[PDB]
Enzyme design. Structure first.
Site, PDB file in Angstrom:
ATOM      1  N   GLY A  27       4.534 -20.860  18.269  1.00  0.00           N
ATOM      2  CA  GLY A  27       5.723 -20.044  18.369  1.00  0.00           C
ATOM      3  C   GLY A  27       5.350 -18.585  18.251  1.00  0.00           C
ATOM      4  O   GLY A  27       4.173 -18.220  18.156  1.00  0.00           O
ATOM      5  N   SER A  28       6.381 -17.752  18.314  1.00  0.00           N
ATOM      6  CA  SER A  28       6.242 -16.311  18.216  1.00  0.00           C
ATOM      7  C   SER A  28       7.388 -15.759  17.387  1.00  0.00           C
ATOM      8  O   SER A  28       8.504 -16.297  17.407  1.00  0.00           O
ATOM      9  CB  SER A  28       6.262 -15.618  19.592  1.00  0.00           C
ATOM     10  OG  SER A  28       7.454 -15.937  20.304  1.00  0.00           O
ATOM     11  N   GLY A  29       7.112 -14.695  16.647  1.00  0.00           N
ATOM     12  CA  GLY A  29       8.172 -14.050  15.909  1.00  0.00           C
ATOM     13  C   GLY A  29       8.161 -12.551  16.135  1.00  0.00           C
ATOM     14  O   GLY A  29       7.630 -12.048  17.129  1.00  0.00           O
ATOM     15  N   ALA A  30       8.781 -11.845  15.188  1.00  0.00           N
ATOM     16  CA  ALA A  30       8.867 -10.389  15.247  1.00  0.00           C
ATOM     17  C   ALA A  30       7.505  -9.750  15.436  1.00  0.00           C
ATOM     18  O   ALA A  30       7.322  -8.918  16.323  1.00  0.00           O
ATOM     19  CB  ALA A  30       9.534  -9.845  13.986  1.00  0.00           C
ATOM     20  N   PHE A  31       6.554 -10.072  14.559  1.00  0.00           N
ATOM     21  CA  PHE A  31       5.280  -9.360  14.502  1.00  0.00           C
ATOM     22  C   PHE A  31       4.059 -10.104  15.024  1.00  0.00           C
ATOM     23  O   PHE A  31       2.962  -9.547  14.957  1.00  0.00           O
ATOM     24  CB  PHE A  31       5.036  -8.897  13.067  1.00  0.00           C
ATOM     25  CG  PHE A  31       6.145  -8.048  12.550  1.00  0.00           C
ATOM     26  CD1 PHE A  31       6.377  -6.803  13.109  1.00  0.00           C
ATOM     27  CD2 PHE A  31       6.994  -8.513  11.561  1.00  0.00           C
ATOM     28  CE1 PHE A  31       7.398  -6.018  12.663  1.00  0.00           C
ATOM     29  CE2 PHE A  31       8.031  -7.725  11.114  1.00  0.00           C
ATOM     30  CZ  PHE A  31       8.228  -6.480  11.664  1.00  0.00           C
ATOM     31  N   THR A  62       2.248 -13.952  17.132  1.00  0.00           N
ATOM     32  CA  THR A  62       2.316 -15.258  17.759  1.00  0.00           C
ATOM     33  C   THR A  62       1.517 -16.199  16.880  1.00  0.00           C
ATOM     34  O   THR A  62       0.381 -15.887  16.503  1.00  0.00           O
ATOM     35  CB  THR A  62       1.758 -15.217  19.188  1.00  0.00           C
ATOM     36  OG1 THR A  62       2.415 -14.183  19.930  1.00  0.00           O
ATOM     37  CG2 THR A  62       1.926 -16.559  19.901  1.00  0.00           C
ATOM     38  N   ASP A  77      12.393 -11.230   4.311  1.00  0.00           N
ATOM     39  CA  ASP A  77      12.649 -11.985   5.535  1.00  0.00           C
ATOM     40  C   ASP A  77      12.821 -13.467   5.235  1.00  0.00           C
ATOM     41  O   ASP A  77      12.330 -14.329   5.974  1.00  0.00           O
ATOM     42  CB  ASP A  77      11.554 -11.771   6.584  1.00  0.00           C
ATOM     43  CG  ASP A  77      11.974 -12.280   7.977  1.00  0.00           C
ATOM     44  OD1 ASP A  77      13.191 -12.493   8.188  1.00  0.00           O
ATOM     45  OD2 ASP A  77      11.104 -12.449   8.863  1.00  0.00           O
ATOM     46  N   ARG A 109      13.536 -20.419   9.037  1.00  0.00           N
ATOM     47  CA  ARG A 109      12.324 -20.367   9.843  1.00  0.00           C
ATOM     48  C   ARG A 109      11.117 -19.939   9.027  1.00  0.00           C
ATOM     49  O   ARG A 109       9.973 -20.146   9.465  1.00  0.00           O
ATOM     50  CB  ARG A 109      12.563 -19.422  11.025  1.00  0.00           C
ATOM     51  CG  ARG A 109      12.896 -18.005  10.601  1.00  0.00           C
ATOM     52  CD  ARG A 109      13.233 -17.057  11.775  1.00  0.00           C
ATOM     53  NE  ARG A 109      13.429 -15.700  11.262  1.00  0.00           N
ATOM     54  CZ  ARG A 109      14.620 -15.157  10.998  1.00  0.00           C
ATOM     55  NH1 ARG A 109      15.730 -15.841  11.239  1.00  0.00           N
ATOM     56  NH2 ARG A 109      14.701 -13.922  10.503  1.00  0.00           N
TER      57      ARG A 109
HETATM   58  N1  LIG Z   1       1.690 -22.380   8.736  1.00  0.00           N
HETATM   59  C1  LIG Z   1       2.383 -22.802   9.784  1.00  0.00           C
HETATM   60  N2  LIG Z   1       2.207 -24.070  10.217  1.00  0.00           N
HETATM   61  C2  LIG Z   1       2.914 -24.488  11.273  1.00  0.00           C
HETATM   62  N3  LIG Z   1       3.807 -23.829  12.003  1.00  0.00           N
HETATM   63  C3  LIG Z   1       3.958 -22.579  11.543  1.00  0.00           C
HETATM   64  C4  LIG Z   1       3.307 -22.005  10.478  1.00  0.00           C
HETATM   65  N4  LIG Z   1       3.730 -20.696  10.306  1.00  0.00           N
HETATM   66  C5  LIG Z   1       4.612 -20.506  11.256  1.00  0.00           C
HETATM   67  N5  LIG Z   1       4.787 -21.613  12.038  1.00  0.00           N
HETATM   68  C6  LIG Z   1       5.680 -21.762  13.161  1.00  0.00           C
HETATM   69  O1  LIG Z   1       5.359 -20.763  14.092  1.00  0.00           O
HETATM   70  C7  LIG Z   1       6.554 -20.290  14.756  1.00  0.00           C
HETATM   71  C8  LIG Z   1       6.533 -18.786  14.773  1.00  0.00           C
HETATM   72  O2  LIG Z   1       6.246 -18.300  13.452  1.00  0.00           O
HETATM   73  P1  LIG Z   1       6.502 -16.749  13.220  1.00  0.00           P
HETATM   74  O3  LIG Z   1       5.753 -15.978  14.244  1.00  0.00           O
HETATM   75  O4  LIG Z   1       6.326 -16.428  11.782  1.00  0.00           O
HETATM   76  O5  LIG Z   1       8.044 -16.643  13.603  1.00  0.00           O
HETATM   77  P2  LIG Z   1       9.404 -16.835  12.811  1.00  0.00           P
HETATM   78  O6  LIG Z   1       9.053 -17.215  11.407  1.00  0.00           O
HETATM   79  O7  LIG Z   1      10.152 -17.823  13.650  1.00  0.00           O
HETATM   80  N6  LIG Z   1      10.028 -15.348  12.930  1.00  0.00           N
HETATM   81  P3  LIG Z   1       9.910 -14.140  11.857  1.00  0.00           P
HETATM   82  O8  LIG Z   1      11.203 -14.019  11.144  1.00  0.00           O
HETATM   83  O9  LIG Z   1       9.660 -12.871  12.572  1.00  0.00           O
HETATM   84  O10 LIG Z   1       8.816 -14.316  10.841  1.00  0.00           O
HETATM   85  C9  LIG Z   1       7.743 -20.933  14.033  1.00  0.00           C
HETATM   86  O11 LIG Z   1       8.326 -21.956  14.829  1.00  0.00           O
HETATM   87  C10 LIG Z   1       7.133 -21.537  12.768  1.00  0.00           C
HETATM   88  O12 LIG Z   1       7.721 -22.785  12.496  1.00  0.00           O
HETATM   89 MG   LIG Z   2       7.893 -16.482   9.885  1.00  0.00          MG
END
Ligand SMILES: Nc1ncnc2c1ncn2[C@@H]1O[C@H](COP(=O)(O)OP(=O)(O)NP(=O)(O)O)[C@@H](O)[C@H]1O
Ligand SMILES: [Mg+2]
Ligand SMILES: O=C(Nc1nccs1)[C@@H](c1cc(F)ccc1O)N1Cc2ccc(-c3ccc(N4CCNCC4)cc3)cc2C1=O
Ligand SMILES: O=C(Nc1nccs1)[C@@H](c1cc(F)ccc1O)N1Cc2ccc(-c3ccc(N4CCNCC4)cc3)cc2C1=O
Ligand SMILES: Nc1ncnc2c1ncn2[C@@H]1O[C@H](COP(=O)(O)OP(=O)(O)NP(=O)(O)O)[C@@H](O)[C@H]1O
Ligand SMILES: [Mg+2]
Lengths: 294, 294
Positions: A20-24, A26, A138, A142
Site C-alpha cells: 500500500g501507500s500512504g501520505a509519506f 509506499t 496520526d 489504518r
Molecule cells: N508492518 C506492516 N505490515 C503489513 N502491512 C503494513 C505494515 N505497515 C503498513 N502496512 C500496510 O501498508 C499500507 C500502507 O501503509 P502506510 O503507507 O503507512 O499508509 P496508511 O497507514 O494507510 N496511511 P498514513 O495515515 O499516511 O500512515 C496499509 O494498507 C497498511 O495496512
Molecule cells: Mg500508516
C-alpha cells in the site's frame, strides 16, 4: 539506545511486493537476507516518497532512534533504516494487515468481545505512548496493525513536523496543536471506524469544511451496533475542550469493564454464534506468530 | 494442559515442500490457514510413515500432550496434531534448519563463541528435560534446530513409552536402557558433530559393530579445533559407567566458563575475524524471528 535501530545495507534486503501507500511513503513486503546466511526473512519496508539530503537524514535518524526504543505489547517498534537517496524504513511484517482492512473484510464474523478488546488494546498502547511523552499525531484504524486477531499494535506514531483532517481534533485543525488529548480525539474516530466495520468518517464532506461542521457541534453519528454507553465515550472524546476529554488510562478501565460483559454494550446480530478466542486457539497463534510477552 | 495441543482439521493446513525424512516420518514445510481468515502461516509438518489406528492414536495423543507442555527457550514445543490415517504433527518452522545442516554449510565461518554457546544452550534444554524427567532418546545435531544463529532449540525428544546406534550409550545399545545419563552420552556425540563441523561419527564402521568397538574402549577422536580441555569433557560423556558421566547441570557451568574465554578452549583458524553479533544484530533478529523470553 542506538543498538535498537539497525542500519541496513541496500544489499541485505529486497522489496518483493507493494502492500500500500500512504501520505509519506509506499509500504512493501520485503525479505531480509542476513549477511553470509541463506534464509529470507519477511519484513515490512516503507520507502519515503521524497528524496532526502544527508543533513535531513540527521533529523530522521534522531526520531528513528526514539521510535526504535518503544517496548510495549501494543506498540510497534521501528527495527531498522536504510539511508538510500529515498530513505527506507524496516519494521516487523504483519501478515494480517491493518485493523481497518481487517474489520472491513470480516465485517460479518466479528463479535463484540473482539471489538471491545481491540479498543482496550489500542488504549493501552496510547497510554504507553503518553507515559513515554510521545504524541501519535496520526491515530486511525489504518495505523493499528493486526499481529493476530487477538493482538493489535499501534504503528506510525511520533512523526512531529512531517493531513488526516477527518481524524484530527478541532484545535489541531485550527491551530496545529497536537497533544495527548488530541490523540484522544483521534482515538474516538478510530473506535468509530471499528464499530462501523470500517466506514469512512464524514463520507462525502470535503476536508476543507470539517472544522466548520465541528464548530457548529455536529459529530460522527451513533454506529448501529453501539449502545449509548459506548456512544457517550466516543462523544466525550470529541469535546471541544481538550482537557475535558477522557484520559487514555480512563479509557482502558471503561472498555475493560465493558469487555467483561460485551453483549451488554454492543448489539451485534449473530453475536452468540460468533468466534471467540479459545485457550487452545490462542496458544497456537502465540507459538506460531506471537511469542512476545503479551 | 490439553489446551496446549491444538487439534487441527485437514482443511486448515497444506504440505507444500519436503524438508527431510527420518526414522518415523517425513518433515514438510507447510502452511496453516486459520478458519475464516485469509493469511497463510508457515509451519513444519511431520507425517508419520506408518498409518495408525484410532486406539493407537490414544497412545500418540497421551505423549503429544506431554511434548506440548515443555516451556524452555532451548526446547521446542509440539504445537498441534492432525489425526489423519498417517498422523501429522505441527510445530514452529525453523527457516535456518537443523544445526547439523547449518554447521556443515558454514564450516569456514563459525567462530568459537558460537560453538561454545551452542553447547551451553543444548545443555540448558537437556537439563530442563531432565528436570521434567523426560528422556530425549534421540539427541543428535540433526535434532537441534537453529531458530537464529544465536539460539538453538532441541527437538524430537520423548519417544519413550512408545535406531541411531552411533549416538547411543553402550547400555542403550545392549540393554535398551535410556536414561538422562545415556542422553549425556548422546550429547557428547552431538558436541563432536558440532566441533567437527558435521562429520559423520565412526565413519566407515558398520552400526552392527559399534557395541564391539565401544566395549574395546574405542571412542570418537579428538576434533582438530578442540583443546584437551574440551575433548576431556566429551570423553567423560562416553564413560561406560553411566553415573560417572557428567550431569547436564555441570555441562552448563563448564561450557559457560569456556564461552567466557572461547579462544583458549577452541583453536579455529581465523577466529579473530568472526565474533558474535553486536547487540544491534541480536535485537534485529529477535524482533523479526525470535521474540520469546530468551
Ligand atoms: N508492518 C506492516 N505490515 C503489513 N502491512 C503494513 C505494515 N505497515 C503498513 N502496512 C500496510 O501498508 C499500507 C500502507 O501503509 P502506510 O503507507 O503507512 O499508509 P496508511 O497507514 O494507510 N496511511 P498514513 O495515515 O499516511 O500512515 C496499509 O494498507 C497498511 O495496512
Ligand atoms: Mg500508516
Ligand atoms: O516506519 C514506519 N512505518 C512502516 N510501515 C512499514 C514499514 S515501516 C513509521 C513508524 C514505525 C514504527 F514501528 C514505529 C513508529 C513509526 O512512526 N515511521 C518512522 C519514521 C521516522 C522518521 C520519518 C521522517 C522524518 C523526517 C523527514 N524529513 C522531511 C520533513 N522535515 C524533516 C525531515 C522524513 C521522514 C518517518 C517515519 C515513519 O513513517
Ligand atoms: O513432531 C515432532 N517433530 C516435528 N518435526 C516437524 C513437524 S513436527 C516430534 C516432537 C516435536 C516437538 F516439538 C517436541 C517433541 C517432539 O518429540 N514428535 C512428537 C511425537 C508424538 C508422538 C509420536 C508417535 C507416538 C507413538 C507412535 N506409535 C503408535 C503405536 N504403534 C506404533 C507407533 C507413533 C508416533 C511421534 C512424535 C514426534 O516425532
Ligand atoms: N521444525 C522444523 N523446522 C525446519 N526443519 C525441520 C524441523 N524439524 C525437522 N526439520 C528438518 O526435517 C528433516 C527431517 O526431520 P526428522 O524426520 O525428525 O529426521 P531426523 O531428525 O533428521 N532423523 P531422526 O533421528 O530419525 O528423527 C531434517 O533435515 C530436519 O533438519
Ligand atoms: Mg528429528
Amino acid at each position: 539506545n542506538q543498538a535498537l535501530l539497525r542500519i541496513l545495507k541496500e544489499t541485505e534486503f529486497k522489496k518483493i511486493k507493494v502492500l500500500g501507500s500512504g501520505a509519506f511513503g509506499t509500504v512493501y513486503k520485503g525479505l531480509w537476507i542476513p549477511e553470509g546466511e541463506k534464509v529470507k526473512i519477511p519484513v515490512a519496508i516503507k520507502e519515503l516518497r521524497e528524496a532526502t539530503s544527508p543533513k535531513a537524514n540527521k533529523e530522521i535518524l534522531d526520531e528513528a532512534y526514539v521510535m526504535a526504543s518503544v517496548d510495549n505489547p501494543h506498540v510497534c517498534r521501528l527495527l531498522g533504516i536504510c539511508l538510500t537517496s529515498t530513505v527506507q524504513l524496516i519494521m516487523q511484517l504483519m501478515p494480517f494487515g491493518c485493523l481497518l482492512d481487517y474489520v472491513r473484510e470480516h465485517k460479518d464474523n466479528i463479535g463484540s468481545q473482539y471489538l471491545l478488546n481491540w479498543c482496550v488494546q489500542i488504549a493501552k498502547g496510547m497510554n504507553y505512548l503518553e507515559d513515554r511523552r510521545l504524541v501519535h499525531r496520526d491515530l486511525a484504524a489504518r495505523n493499528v496493525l493486526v499481529k493476530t486477531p487477538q493482538h493489535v499494535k499501534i504503528t506510525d506514531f511520533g512523526l512531529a513536523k512531517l493531513v488526516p483532517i477527518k481524524w484530527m481534533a478541532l484545535e489541531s485543525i485550527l491551530h496545529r496543536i497536537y497533544t495527548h488529548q488530541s490523540d484522544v480525539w483521534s482515538y474516538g474516530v478510530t473506535v468509530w471506524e471499528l464499530m462501523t466495520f470500517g466506514s469512512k468518517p464524514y463520507d462525502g464532506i470535503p476536508a476543507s469544511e470539517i472544522s466548520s461542521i465541528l464548530e457548529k457541534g455536529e459529530r460522527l453519528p451513533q454506529p448501529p451496533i453501539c449502545t449509548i454507553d459506548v456512544y457517550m465515550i466516543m462523544r466525550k472524546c470529541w469535546m471541544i475542550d481538550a482537557d475535558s476529554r477522557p484520559k487514555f488510562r480512563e479509557l482502558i478501565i471503561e472498555f475493560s469493564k465493558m469487555a467483561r460483559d460485551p453483549q451488554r454494550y454492543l448489539v451485534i446480530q449473530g453475536d452468540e454464534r460468533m468466534h471467540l478466542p479459545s485457550p487452545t486457539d490462542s496458544n497456537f497463534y502465540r507459538a506460531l506468530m506471537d511469542e512476545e510477552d503479551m
